[PDB]
DNA sequence: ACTGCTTTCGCATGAACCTCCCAACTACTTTTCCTCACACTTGTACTCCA
């Protein structure tokens, strides 16, 4: 609950370095094809979101998977 | 004097206790595991007042 699945991933990418050995590349195209069909919206929002993504993004691709072995906070 | 008062004795073989523990199911602890949002600063935003 409430990022307990997420904070362990943050503790997992940090303790064992999934970063800098593997590819921490979240294929966001394979994620939002679901979210179109979850609530049955027209497929323009698949690309309407994409340019909102590609406007506000450091390094256009690759929403970064995060690593944390730093502390428990 | 004499009673009561004893004392051995028996047709032959076959055979014919009790308290505490371990019960049964209740309840009220143990044995260390994981999972984090909380205190003061500080840096960065968009105001300020001289």
């Amino acid at each position: 609950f409430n990022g307990q699945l997420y904070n362990k991933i943050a503790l997992t990418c940090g303790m064992i370095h999934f970063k800098e050995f593997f590819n921490s590349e979240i294929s966001c195209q394979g994620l939002l094809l679901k979210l179109v069909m979850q609530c049955a919206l027209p497929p323009e929002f698949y690309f309407y979101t994409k340019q909102v993504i590609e406007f506000e993004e450091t390094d256009i691709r690759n929403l970064t998977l995060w690593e944390r072995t730093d502390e428990r906070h």
Side-chain angles (χ1 to χ4, degrees):
Chain A
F1 63 96
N2 300 326
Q4 186 185 4
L5 199 150
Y6 290 112
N7 292 321
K8 184 61 70 177
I9 291 169
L11 266 296
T12 309
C13 294
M15 279 214 170
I16 52 170
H17 294 87
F18 183 76
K19 299 298 290 184
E20 82 198 4
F21 292 154
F22 297 94
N23 46 0
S24 69
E25 293 179 353
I26 299 300
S27 67
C28 299
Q29 286 80 15
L31 194 148
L32 294 177
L33 180 57
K34 183 176 181 179
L35 275 80
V36 172
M37 298 176 73
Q38 293 292 105
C39 64
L41 49 82
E44 297 178 357
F45 301 103
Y46 176 75
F47 299 106
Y48 287 166
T49 305
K50 184 180 287 186
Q51 301 300 319
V52 177
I53 296 167
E54 290 170 351
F55 180 80
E56 185 68 31
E57 183 70 28
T58 62
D59 307 17
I60 308 299
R61 194 60 263 162
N62 298 321
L63 278 170
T64 64
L65 177 59
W66 186 52
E67 57 95 19
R68 180 180 67 195
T69 184
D70 201 357
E71 68 265 14
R72 54 177 283 272
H73 293 288

